[PDB]
Amino acid sequence: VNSFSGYLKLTDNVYIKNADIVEEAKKVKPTVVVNAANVYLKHGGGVAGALNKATNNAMQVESDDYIATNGPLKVGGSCVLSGHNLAKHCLHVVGPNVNKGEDIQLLKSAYENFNQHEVLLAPLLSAGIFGADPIHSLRVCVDTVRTNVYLAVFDKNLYDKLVSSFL
Ligand SMILES: CC(C)[C@H](CO)Nc1ncnc2[nH]c3c(N)cccc3c12
Ligand SMILES: [Cl-]
Numbered sequence: 001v002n003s004f005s006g007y008l009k010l011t012d013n014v015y016i017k018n019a020d021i022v023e024e025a026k027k028v029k030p031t032v033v034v035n036a037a038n039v040y041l042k043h044g045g046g047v048a049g050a051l052n053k054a055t056n057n058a059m060q061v062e063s064d065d066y067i068a069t070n071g072p073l074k075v076g077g078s079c080v081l082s083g084h085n086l087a088k089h090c091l092h093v094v095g096p097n098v099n100k101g102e103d104i105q106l107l108k109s110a111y112e113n114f115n116q117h118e119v120l121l122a123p124l125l126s127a128g129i130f131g132a133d134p135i136h137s138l139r140v141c142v143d144t145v146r147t148n149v150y151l152a153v154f155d156k157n158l159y160d161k162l163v164s165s166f167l
Contacts, residue, residue: 002119003028004150010166014142014149018159021047021123021152022054025086030150033083034114034122035059036130037092039072041079046129047154055084063092075102076109091117098131107137111144119148128154138162 007015017024025033036047041063043052052059062081073079078093095110096102110125124141126132134153141149153159 002148004030004121007150008163010138011142013146014151016138016151016153016159016162018154018156019152020050020154021121022050022086024152025051025083025121026054028121029087030083030119030121031088032091032117032120033087033089034120034125035090035092036123036125036128037073037078037094038097039075039077039094041067041073041092047123051086051090054086058082058084059090076106078110078113087121091120093125095126095130095137096132097129098126099129104132104136107132107140108144111141114141114145114149115147117147119150121150121152123152123154134158135162135165138166 007017009015035051043049043060073094075094075096078091081090083090093110093113096106107126114120124134124137127134127137
């Protein structure tokens with residue numbers, strides 16, 4: 001039993017909700033919140049901008065130190081950093097950004113990072129400003145993640161389309 005509320009169960013291990021991941025994180029304080037990161041951990045917009053703003057820029061400060069030490073992530077890769085006031089940990093995961101020309105086949109690799117964590121709150125990787133089809137992102141998630149994932153979809157209209165079209 002966990003503290004997530006109001007989710008629709010899609011499969012054994014995947015759950016979904018129309019919600020703002022920032023407000024959802026601030027209420028559940030999950031062990032792991034997933035950020036829709038880029039390789040530079042520059043949290044400017046989209047989910048990353050909203051998560052970082054909610055931490056009063058502490059996420060960005062921590063991230064800049066991480067990059068200065070380790071260099072950029074790989075597309076499809078991840079790193080674990082602090083969750084600040086939102087969660088115990090933040091798993092920064094780099095989905096391919098279609099608006100940069102990155103290979104959508106890397107979306108599966110990106111979701112594989114979730115399997116290193118028993119339970120996660122997450123957005124749909126590569127959705128929104130990363131330019132991928134969210135219906136495809138949800139499909140890859142369901143077919144790749146084996147751990148317990150609670151997906152937050154900010155747009156109420158998009159959520160209903162994902163549910164009604166889910167196979
Ligand atoms: C990945 C997309 C399919 C999805 C579209 O809804 N992105 C989000 N999902 C969940 N929560 C989100 N919060 C946001 C805030 N605060 C600012 C900007 C974007 C989001 C967002
Ligand atoms: Cl987003």
